[PDB]
Amino acid sequence: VEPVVVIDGKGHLVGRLASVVAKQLLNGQKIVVVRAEELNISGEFFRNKLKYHDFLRKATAFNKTRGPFHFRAPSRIFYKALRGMVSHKTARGKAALERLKVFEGIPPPYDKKKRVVVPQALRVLRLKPGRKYTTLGKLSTSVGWKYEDVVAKLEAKRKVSSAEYYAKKRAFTKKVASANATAAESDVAKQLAALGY
């Protein structure tokens, strides 16, 4: 519906998240996942780590500067989960991926902008209560990524500024919600009610 669509890749599920982003593209929709670190997978930590690790064990024997480039950053860690999900060797693929954008944390001008979620890839909904999931921030760190802390720091501060903005918001909202209530029962008003609005 929009030109761009900003997803809040938090508490999501890499897979179901990627797969809902993937096709979304191929259909020409621009997308920008954020808060990648906070992303989720499925299964007792170790589990995943052990998993990735075996992936981190595959290299072009004779010249490892040529083989599978193993990315840590939660982003890339989730760009490979969406990549291999799109005929990325063709042209219609490259053209697709090119309208995709993964961000670990939330930078501008995305900050000051609405950010959606994908119910069908929401861990809370999908997963069954009491079943180990494995955040993405951890896995990443414990395998190479080295900016977990910074972001964290830069994320907390990015919220504050956010909070305040809100506060200001909740207020101005109240004010309008109170004035409206006072505009009730006024011919015009009265009428609208009969026409739902």
Partner: protein, 136 residues
């Protein structure tokens, strides 16, 4: 020195809990849980709403926050007796949830000219409300 335990409070599935059917032939009508079968299935009947007495999944249905006094295993006439006596229909219509359902249905069956009335009335309401603000 009090023992304040915030208690999460749910809609319990019980005999006499009124429900609203999401999908099917009935779809959007009220019924009362007459008897509980197992964890997934209940037994429902809303005679005044018109829904026949049936075994339904709780996936098909959504619990509403209203209750009334119904004895278990109640046949249709007993359900209609306690239904009318407790007046759960008017308690339903009083709630915000029924008003929201009726709101969507009112907007659905709107004529283009009636939609143009909404255009004009919202312009007028906007004017007086914007004057109501920029004062305090």
């Amino acid at each position: 020195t009090d023992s304040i335990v915030k208690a999460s409070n749910w809609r319990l599935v019980e005999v006499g809990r009124v429900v609203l059917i999401k999908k099917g032939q009935s779809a959007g009508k009220l019924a009362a849980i007459v008897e509980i079968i197992d964890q997934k299935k209940v037994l429902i009947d809303g005679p005044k709403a018109g829904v026949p007495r049936q075994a339904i999944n709780l996936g098909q249905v959504v619990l509403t926050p209203l209750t009334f006094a119904l004895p278990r295993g109640a046949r249709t006439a007993t359900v209609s007796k306690k239904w009318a006596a407790a007046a759960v229909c008017e308690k339903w219509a009083a709630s915000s949830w029924a008003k929201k359902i009726a709101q969507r249905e009112r907007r659905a069956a709107l004529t283009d000219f009636e939609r143009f009335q909404v255009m004009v009335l919202r312009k007028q309401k906007r004017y007086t409300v914007k004057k109501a603000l920029a004062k305090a």
